[PDB]
JSON list of C-alpha atoms in Angstrom, two decimals:
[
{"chain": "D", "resi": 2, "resn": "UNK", "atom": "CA", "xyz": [36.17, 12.03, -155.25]},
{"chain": "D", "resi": 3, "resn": "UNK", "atom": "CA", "xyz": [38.34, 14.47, -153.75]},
{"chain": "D", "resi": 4, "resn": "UNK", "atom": "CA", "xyz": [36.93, 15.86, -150.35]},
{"chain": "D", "resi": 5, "resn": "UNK", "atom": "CA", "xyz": [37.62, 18.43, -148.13]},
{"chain": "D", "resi": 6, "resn": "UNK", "atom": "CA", "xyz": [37.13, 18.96, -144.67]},
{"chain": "D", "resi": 7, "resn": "UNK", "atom": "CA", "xyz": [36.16, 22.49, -142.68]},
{"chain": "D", "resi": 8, "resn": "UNK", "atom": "CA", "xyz": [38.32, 22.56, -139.28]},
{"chain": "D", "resi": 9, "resn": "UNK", "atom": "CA", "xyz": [38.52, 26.25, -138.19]},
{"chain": "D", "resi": 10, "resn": "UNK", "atom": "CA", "xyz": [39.94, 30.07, -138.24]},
{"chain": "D", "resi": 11, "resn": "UNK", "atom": "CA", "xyz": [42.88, 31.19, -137.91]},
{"chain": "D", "resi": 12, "resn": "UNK", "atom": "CA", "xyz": [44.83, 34.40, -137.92]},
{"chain": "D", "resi": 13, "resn": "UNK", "atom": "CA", "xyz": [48.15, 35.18, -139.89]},
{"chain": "D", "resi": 14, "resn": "UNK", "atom": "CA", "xyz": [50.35, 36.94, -138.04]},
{"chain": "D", "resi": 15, "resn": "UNK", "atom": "CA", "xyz": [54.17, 38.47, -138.58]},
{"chain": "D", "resi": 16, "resn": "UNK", "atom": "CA", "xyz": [53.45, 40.60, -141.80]},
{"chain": "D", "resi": 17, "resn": "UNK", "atom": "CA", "xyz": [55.85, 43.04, -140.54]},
{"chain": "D", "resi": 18, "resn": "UNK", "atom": "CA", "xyz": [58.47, 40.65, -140.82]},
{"chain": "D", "resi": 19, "resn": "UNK", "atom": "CA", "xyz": [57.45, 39.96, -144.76]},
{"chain": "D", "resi": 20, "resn": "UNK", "atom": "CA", "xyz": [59.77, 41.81, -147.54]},
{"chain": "D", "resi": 21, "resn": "UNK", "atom": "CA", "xyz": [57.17, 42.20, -150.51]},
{"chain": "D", "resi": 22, "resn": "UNK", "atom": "CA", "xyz": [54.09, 42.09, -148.04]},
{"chain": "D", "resi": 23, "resn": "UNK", "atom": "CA", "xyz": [52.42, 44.85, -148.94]},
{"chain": "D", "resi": 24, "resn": "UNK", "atom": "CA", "xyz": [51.97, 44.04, -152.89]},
{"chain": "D", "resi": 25, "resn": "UNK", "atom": "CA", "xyz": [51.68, 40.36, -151.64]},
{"chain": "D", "resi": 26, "resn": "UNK", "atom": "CA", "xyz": [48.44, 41.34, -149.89]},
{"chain": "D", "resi": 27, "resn": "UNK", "atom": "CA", "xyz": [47.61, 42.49, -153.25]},
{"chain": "D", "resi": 28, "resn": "UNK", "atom": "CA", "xyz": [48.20, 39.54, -155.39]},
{"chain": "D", "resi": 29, "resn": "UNK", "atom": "CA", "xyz": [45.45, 37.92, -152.97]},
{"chain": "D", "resi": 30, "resn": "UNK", "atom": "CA", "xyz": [41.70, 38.84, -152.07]},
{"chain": "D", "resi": 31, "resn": "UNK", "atom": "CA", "xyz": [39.44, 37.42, -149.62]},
{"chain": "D", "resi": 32, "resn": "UNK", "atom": "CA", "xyz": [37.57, 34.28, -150.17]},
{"chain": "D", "resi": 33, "resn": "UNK", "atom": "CA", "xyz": [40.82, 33.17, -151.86]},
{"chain": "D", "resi": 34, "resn": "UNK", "atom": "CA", "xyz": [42.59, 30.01, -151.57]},
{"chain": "D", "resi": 35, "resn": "UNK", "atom": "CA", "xyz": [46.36, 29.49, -149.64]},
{"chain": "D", "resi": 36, "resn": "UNK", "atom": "CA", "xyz": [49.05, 27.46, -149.22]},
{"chain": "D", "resi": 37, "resn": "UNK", "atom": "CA", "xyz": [50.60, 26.12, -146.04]},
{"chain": "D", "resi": 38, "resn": "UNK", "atom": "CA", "xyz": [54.24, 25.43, -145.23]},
{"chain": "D", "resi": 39, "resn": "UNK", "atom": "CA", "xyz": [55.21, 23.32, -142.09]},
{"chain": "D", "resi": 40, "resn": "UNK", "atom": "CA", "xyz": [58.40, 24.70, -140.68]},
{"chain": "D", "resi": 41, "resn": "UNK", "atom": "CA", "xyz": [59.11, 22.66, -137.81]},
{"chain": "D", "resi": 42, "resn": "UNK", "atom": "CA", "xyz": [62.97, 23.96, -138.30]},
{"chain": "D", "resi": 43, "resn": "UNK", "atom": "CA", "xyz": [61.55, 26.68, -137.39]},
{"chain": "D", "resi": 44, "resn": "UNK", "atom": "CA", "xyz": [64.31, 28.58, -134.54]},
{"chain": "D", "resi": 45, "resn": "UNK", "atom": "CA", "xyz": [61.38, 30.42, -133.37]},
{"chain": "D", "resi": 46, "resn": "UNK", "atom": "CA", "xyz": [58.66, 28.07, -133.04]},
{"chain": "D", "resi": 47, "resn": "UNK", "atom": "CA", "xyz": [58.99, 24.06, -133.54]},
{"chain": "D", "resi": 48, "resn": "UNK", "atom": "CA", "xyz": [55.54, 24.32, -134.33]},
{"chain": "D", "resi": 49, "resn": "UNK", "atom": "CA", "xyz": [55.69, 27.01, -136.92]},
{"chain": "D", "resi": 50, "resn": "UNK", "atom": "CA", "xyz": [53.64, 27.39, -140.09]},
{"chain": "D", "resi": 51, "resn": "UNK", "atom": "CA", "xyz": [54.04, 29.60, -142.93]},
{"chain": "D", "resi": 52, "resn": "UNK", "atom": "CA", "xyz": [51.35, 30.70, -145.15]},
{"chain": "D", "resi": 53, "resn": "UNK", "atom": "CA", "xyz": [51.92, 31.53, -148.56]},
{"chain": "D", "resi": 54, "resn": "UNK", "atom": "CA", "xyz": [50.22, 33.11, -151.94]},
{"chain": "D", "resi": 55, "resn": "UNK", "atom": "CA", "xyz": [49.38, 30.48, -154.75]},
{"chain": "D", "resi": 56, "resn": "UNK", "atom": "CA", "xyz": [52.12, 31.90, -156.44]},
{"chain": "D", "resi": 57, "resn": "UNK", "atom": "CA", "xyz": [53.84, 31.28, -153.44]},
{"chain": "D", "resi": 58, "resn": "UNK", "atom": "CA", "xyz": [54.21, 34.42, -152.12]},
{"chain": "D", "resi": 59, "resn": "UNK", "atom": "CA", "xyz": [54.89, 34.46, -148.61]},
{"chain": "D", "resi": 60, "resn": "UNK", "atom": "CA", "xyz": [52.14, 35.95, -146.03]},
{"chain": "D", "resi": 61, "resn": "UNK", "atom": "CA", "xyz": [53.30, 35.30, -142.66]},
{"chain": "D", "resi": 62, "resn": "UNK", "atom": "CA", "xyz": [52.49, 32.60, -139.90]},
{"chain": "D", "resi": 63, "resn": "UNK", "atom": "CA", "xyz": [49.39, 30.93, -137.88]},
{"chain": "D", "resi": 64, "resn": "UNK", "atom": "CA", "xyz": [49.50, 32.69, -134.47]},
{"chain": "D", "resi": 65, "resn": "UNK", "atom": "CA", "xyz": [51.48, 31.14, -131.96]},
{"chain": "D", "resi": 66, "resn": "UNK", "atom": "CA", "xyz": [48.20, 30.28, -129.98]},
{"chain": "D", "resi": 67, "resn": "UNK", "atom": "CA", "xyz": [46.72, 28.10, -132.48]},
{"chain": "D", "resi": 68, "resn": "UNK", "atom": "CA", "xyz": [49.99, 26.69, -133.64]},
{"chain": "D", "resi": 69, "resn": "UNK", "atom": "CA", "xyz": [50.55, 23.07, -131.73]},
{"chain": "D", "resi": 70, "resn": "UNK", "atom": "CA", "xyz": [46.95, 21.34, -133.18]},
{"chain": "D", "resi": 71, "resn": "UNK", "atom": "CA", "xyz": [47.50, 22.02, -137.26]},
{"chain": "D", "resi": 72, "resn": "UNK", "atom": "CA", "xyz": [51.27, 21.22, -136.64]},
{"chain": "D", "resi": 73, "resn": "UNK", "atom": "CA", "xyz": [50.31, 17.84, -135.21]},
{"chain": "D", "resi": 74, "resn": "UNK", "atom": "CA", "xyz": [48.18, 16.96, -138.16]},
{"chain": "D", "resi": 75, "resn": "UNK", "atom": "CA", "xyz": [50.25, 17.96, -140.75]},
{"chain": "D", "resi": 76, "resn": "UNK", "atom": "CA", "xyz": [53.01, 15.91, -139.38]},
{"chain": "D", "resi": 77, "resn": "UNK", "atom": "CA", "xyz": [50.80, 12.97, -139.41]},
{"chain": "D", "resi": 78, "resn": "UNK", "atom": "CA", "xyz": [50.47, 13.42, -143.47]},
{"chain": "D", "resi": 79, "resn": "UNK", "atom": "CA", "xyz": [47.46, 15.03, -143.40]},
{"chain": "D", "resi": 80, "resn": "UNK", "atom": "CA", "xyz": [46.95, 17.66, -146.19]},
{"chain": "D", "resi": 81, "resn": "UNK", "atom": "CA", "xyz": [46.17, 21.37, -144.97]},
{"chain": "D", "resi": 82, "resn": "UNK", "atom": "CA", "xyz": [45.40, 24.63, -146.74]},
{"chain": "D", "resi": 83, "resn": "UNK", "atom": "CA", "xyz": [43.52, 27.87, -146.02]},
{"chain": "D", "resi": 84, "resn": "UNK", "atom": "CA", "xyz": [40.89, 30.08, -147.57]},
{"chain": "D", "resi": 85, "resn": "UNK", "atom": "CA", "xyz": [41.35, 33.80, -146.83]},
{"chain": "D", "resi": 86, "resn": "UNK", "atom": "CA", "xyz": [38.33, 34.70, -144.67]},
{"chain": "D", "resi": 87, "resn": "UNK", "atom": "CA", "xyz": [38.97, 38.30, -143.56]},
{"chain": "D", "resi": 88, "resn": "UNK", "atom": "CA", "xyz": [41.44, 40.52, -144.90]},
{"chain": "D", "resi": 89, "resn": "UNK", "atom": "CA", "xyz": [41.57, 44.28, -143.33]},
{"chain": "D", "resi": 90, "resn": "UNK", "atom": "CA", "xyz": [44.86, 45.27, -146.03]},
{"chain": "D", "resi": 91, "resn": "UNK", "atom": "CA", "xyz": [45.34, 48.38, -144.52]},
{"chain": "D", "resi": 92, "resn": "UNK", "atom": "CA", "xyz": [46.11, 46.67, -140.80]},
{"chain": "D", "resi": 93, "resn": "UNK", "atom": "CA", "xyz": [47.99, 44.03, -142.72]},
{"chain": "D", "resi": 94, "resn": "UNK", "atom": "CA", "xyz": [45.43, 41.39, -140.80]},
{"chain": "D", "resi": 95, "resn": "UNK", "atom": "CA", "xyz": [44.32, 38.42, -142.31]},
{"chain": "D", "resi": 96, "resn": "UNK", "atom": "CA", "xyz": [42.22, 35.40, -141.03]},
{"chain": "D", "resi": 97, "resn": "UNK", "atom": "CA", "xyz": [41.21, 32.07, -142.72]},
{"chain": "D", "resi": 98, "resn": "UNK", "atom": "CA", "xyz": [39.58, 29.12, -142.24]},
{"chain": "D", "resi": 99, "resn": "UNK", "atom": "CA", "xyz": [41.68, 26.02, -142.79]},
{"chain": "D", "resi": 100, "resn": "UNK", "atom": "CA", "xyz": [40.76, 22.91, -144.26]},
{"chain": "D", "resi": 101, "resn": "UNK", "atom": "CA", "xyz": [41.82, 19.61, -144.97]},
{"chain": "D", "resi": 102, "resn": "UNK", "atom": "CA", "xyz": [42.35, 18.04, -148.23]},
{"chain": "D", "resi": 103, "resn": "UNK", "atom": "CA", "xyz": [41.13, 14.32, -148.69]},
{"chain": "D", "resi": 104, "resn": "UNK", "atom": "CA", "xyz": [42.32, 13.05, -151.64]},
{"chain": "N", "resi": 2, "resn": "UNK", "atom": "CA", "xyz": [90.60, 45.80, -131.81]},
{"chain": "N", "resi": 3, "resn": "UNK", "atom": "CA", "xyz": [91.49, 47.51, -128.06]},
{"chain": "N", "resi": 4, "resn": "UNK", "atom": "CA", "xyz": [88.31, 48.78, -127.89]},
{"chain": "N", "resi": 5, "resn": "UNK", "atom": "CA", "xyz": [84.38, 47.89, -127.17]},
{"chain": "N", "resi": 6, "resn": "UNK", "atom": "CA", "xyz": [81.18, 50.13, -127.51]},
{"chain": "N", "resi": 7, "resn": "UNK", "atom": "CA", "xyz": [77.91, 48.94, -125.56]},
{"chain": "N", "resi": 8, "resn": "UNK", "atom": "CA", "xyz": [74.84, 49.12, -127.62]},
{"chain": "N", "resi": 9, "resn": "UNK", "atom": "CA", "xyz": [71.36, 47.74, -126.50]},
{"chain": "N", "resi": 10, "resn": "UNK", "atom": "CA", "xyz": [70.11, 44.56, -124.56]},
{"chain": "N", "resi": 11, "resn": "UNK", "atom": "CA", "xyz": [68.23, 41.59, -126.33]},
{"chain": "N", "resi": 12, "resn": "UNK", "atom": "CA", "xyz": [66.56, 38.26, -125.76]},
{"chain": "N", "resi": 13, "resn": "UNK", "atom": "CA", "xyz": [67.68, 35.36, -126.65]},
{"chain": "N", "resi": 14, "resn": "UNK", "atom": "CA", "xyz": [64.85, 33.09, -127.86]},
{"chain": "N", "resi": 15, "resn": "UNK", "atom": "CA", "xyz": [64.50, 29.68, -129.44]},
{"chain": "N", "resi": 16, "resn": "UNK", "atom": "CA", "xyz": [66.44, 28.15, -126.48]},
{"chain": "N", "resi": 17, "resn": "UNK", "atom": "CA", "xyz": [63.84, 24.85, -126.14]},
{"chain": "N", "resi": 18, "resn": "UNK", "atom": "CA", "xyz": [64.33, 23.81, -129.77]},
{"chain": "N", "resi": 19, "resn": "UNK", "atom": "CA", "xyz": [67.69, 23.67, -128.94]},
{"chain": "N", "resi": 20, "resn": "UNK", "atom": "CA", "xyz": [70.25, 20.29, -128.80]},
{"chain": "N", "resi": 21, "resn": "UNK", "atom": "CA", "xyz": [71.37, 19.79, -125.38]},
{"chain": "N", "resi": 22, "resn": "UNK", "atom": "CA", "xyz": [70.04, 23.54, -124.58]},
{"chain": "N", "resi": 23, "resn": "UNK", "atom": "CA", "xyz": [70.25, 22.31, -120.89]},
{"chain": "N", "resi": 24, "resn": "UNK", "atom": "CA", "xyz": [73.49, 21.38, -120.67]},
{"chain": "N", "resi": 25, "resn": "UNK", "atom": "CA", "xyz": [74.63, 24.23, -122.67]},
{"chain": "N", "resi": 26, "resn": "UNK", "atom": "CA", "xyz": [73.18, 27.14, -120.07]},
{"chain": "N", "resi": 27, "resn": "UNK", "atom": "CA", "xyz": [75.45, 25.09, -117.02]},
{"chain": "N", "resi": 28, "resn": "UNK", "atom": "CA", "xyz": [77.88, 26.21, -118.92]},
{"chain": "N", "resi": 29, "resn": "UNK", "atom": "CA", "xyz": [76.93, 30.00, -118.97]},
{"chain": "N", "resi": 30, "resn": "UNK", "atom": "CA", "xyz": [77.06, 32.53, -116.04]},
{"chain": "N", "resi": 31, "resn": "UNK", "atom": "CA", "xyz": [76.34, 36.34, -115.54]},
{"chain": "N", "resi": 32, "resn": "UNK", "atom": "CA", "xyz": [79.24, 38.60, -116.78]},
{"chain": "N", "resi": 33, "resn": "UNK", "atom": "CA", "xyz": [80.27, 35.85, -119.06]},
{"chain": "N", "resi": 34, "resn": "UNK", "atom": "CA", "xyz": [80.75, 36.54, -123.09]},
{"chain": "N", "resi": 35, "resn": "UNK", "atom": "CA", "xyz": [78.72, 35.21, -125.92]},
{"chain": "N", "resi": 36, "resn": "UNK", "atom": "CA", "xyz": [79.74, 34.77, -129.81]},
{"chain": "N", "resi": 37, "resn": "UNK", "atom": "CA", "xyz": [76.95, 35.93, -132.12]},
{"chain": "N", "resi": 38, "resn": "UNK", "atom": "CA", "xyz": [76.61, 34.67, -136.19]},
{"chain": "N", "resi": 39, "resn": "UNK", "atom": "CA", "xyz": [74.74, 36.32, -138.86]},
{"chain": "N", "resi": 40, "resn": "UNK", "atom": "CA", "xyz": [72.72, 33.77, -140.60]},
{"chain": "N", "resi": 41, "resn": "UNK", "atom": "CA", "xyz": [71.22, 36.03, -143.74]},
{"chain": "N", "resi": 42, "resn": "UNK", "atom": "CA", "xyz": [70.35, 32.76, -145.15]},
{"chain": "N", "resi": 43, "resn": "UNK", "atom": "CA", "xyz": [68.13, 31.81, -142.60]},
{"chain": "N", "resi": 44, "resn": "UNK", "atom": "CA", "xyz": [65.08, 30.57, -144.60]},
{"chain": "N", "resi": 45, "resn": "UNK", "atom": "CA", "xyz": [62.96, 31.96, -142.11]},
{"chain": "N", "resi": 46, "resn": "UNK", "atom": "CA", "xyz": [64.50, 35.25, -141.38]},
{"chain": "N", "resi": 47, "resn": "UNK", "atom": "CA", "xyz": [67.25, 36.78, -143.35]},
{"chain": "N", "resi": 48, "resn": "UNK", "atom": "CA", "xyz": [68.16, 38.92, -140.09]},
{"chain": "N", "resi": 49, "resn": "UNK", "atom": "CA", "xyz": [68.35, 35.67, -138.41]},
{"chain": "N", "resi": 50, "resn": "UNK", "atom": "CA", "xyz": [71.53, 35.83, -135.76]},
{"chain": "N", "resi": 51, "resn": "UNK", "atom": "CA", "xyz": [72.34, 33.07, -133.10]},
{"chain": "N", "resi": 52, "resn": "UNK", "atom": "CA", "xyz": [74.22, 33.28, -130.54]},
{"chain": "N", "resi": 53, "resn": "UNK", "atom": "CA", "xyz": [77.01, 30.63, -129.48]},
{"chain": "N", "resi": 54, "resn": "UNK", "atom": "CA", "xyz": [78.82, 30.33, -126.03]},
{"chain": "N", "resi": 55, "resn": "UNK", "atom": "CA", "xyz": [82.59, 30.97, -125.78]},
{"chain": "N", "resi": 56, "resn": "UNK", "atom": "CA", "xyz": [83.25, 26.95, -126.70]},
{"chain": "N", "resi": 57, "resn": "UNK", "atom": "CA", "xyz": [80.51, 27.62, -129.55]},
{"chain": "N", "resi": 58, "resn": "UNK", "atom": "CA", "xyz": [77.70, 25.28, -128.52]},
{"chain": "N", "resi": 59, "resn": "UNK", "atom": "CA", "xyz": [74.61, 26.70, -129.30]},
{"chain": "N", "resi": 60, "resn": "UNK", "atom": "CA", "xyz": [71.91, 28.70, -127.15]},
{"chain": "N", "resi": 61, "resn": "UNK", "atom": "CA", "xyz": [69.47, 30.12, -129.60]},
{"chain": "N", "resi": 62, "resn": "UNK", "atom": "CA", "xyz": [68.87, 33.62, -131.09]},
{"chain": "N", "resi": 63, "resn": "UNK", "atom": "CA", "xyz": [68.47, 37.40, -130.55]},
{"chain": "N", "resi": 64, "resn": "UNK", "atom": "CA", "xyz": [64.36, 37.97, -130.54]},
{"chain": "N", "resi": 65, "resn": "UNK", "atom": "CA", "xyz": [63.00, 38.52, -134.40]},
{"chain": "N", "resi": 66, "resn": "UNK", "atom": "CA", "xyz": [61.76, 42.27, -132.73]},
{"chain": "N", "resi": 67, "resn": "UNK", "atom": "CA", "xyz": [65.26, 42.55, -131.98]},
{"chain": "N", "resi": 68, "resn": "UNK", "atom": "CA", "xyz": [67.22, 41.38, -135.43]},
{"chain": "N", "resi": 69, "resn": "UNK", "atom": "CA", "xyz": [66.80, 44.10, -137.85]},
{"chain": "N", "resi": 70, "resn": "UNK", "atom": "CA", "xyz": [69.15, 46.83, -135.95]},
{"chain": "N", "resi": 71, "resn": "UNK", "atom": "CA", "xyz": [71.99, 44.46, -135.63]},
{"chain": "N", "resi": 72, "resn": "UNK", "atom": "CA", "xyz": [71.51, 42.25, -138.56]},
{"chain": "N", "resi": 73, "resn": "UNK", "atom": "CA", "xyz": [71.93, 45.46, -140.69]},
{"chain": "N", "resi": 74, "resn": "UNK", "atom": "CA", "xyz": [75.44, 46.42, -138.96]},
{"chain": "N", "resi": 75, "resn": "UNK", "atom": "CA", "xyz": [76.52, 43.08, -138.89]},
{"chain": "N", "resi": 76, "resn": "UNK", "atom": "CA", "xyz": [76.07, 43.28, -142.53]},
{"chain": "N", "resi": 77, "resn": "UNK", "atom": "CA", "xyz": [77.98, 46.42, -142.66]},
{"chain": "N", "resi": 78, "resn": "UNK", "atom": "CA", "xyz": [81.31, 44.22, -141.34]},
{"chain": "N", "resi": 79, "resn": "UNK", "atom": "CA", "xyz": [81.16, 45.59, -137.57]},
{"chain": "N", "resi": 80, "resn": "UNK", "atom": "CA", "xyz": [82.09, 42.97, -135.17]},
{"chain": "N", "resi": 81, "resn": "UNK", "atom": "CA", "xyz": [79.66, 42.38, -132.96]},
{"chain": "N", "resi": 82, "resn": "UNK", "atom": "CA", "xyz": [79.51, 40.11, -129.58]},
{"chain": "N", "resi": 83, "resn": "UNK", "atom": "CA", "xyz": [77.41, 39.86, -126.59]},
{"chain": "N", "resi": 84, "resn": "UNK", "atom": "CA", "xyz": [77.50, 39.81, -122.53]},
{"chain": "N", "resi": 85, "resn": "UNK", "atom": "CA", "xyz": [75.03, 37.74, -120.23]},
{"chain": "N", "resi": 86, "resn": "UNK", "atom": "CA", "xyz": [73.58, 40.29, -118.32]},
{"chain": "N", "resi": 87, "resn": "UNK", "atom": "CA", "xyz": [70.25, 37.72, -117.24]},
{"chain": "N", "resi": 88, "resn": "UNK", "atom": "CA", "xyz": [69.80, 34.16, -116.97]},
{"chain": "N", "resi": 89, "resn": "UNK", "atom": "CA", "xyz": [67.09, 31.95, -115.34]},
{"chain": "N", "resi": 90, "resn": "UNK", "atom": "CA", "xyz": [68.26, 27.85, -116.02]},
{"chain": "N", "resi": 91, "resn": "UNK", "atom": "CA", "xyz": [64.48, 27.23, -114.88]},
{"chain": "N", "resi": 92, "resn": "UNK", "atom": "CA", "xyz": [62.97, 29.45, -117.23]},
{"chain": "N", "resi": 93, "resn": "UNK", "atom": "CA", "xyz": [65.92, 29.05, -120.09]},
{"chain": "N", "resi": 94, "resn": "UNK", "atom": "CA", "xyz": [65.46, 32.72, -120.38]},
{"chain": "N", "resi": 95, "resn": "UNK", "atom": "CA", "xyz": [68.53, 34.60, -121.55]},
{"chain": "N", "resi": 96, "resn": "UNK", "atom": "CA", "xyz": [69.10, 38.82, -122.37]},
{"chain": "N", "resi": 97, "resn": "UNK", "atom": "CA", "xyz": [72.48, 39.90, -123.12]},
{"chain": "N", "resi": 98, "resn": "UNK", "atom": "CA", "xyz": [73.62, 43.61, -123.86]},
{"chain": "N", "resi": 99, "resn": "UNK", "atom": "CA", "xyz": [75.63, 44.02, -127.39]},
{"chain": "N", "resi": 100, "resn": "UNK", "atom": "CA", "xyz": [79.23, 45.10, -127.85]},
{"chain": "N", "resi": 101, "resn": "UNK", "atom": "CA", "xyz": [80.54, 46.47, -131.06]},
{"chain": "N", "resi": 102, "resn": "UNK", "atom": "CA", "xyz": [84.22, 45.50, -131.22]},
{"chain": "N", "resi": 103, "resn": "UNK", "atom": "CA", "xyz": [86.35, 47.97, -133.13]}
]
């Protein structure tokens, strides 16, 4: 059908750095669904990802140190997306567990 | 413009994902001058700044912990520049201490 495939946690990191973030945390609650954005323009990080809102709303990034693996799969085509697995809004934190979409 | 005020050091990061980043930093020495660019539209970071040497080849940009303070007065219309004040080719590590030109 359409298939998807558990890899493992991450946490999103740089809400600081987010405009809107705190009424972006709000448009999203945990157990939630997210998109990712591979930024390898990134000046920061060639490795970078973005997360985002489903209304595209952006979040922040995948820590630094658990960066390279994702960003190797995604640049091999392979479809990746997260599901908000702990929030803690008042800390700004937020972890997920990514997964890959086989379509 | 006769006249320069010191403001705070920064680090310049992103050097690695830089285009010939090596051969750029042979170019640079301590005391030397550096050309900074606000980049607002930086999809990434809308205090985004890089900073250029003298002949305006690329070395990277000031830290994202670092942006905000600078970004804003750059915004503002100060001029703003930079000095090398560290450098380690090895380590392509590279802090600089601010100048507003006025």
């Amino acid at each position: 059908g359409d298939a998807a495939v558990a890899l493992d946690t991450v946490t999103v990191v740089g809400e600081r750095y987010v405009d809107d973030i705190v009424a972006t945390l709000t448009t999203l609650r945990v157990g939630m669904a997210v998109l990712l954005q591979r930024e390898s323009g990134n000046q920061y990080d060639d490795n970078a990802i973005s997360v985002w809102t489903l209304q595209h709303a952006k979040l922040g990034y995948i820590a630094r140190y658990q960066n390279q693996p994702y960003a190797t799969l995604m640049d091999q085509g392979q479809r990746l997306y997260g599901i908000v697995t702990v929030l803690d809004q008042q800390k700004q934190h937020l972890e997920l567990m990514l997964w890959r979409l086989e379509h």
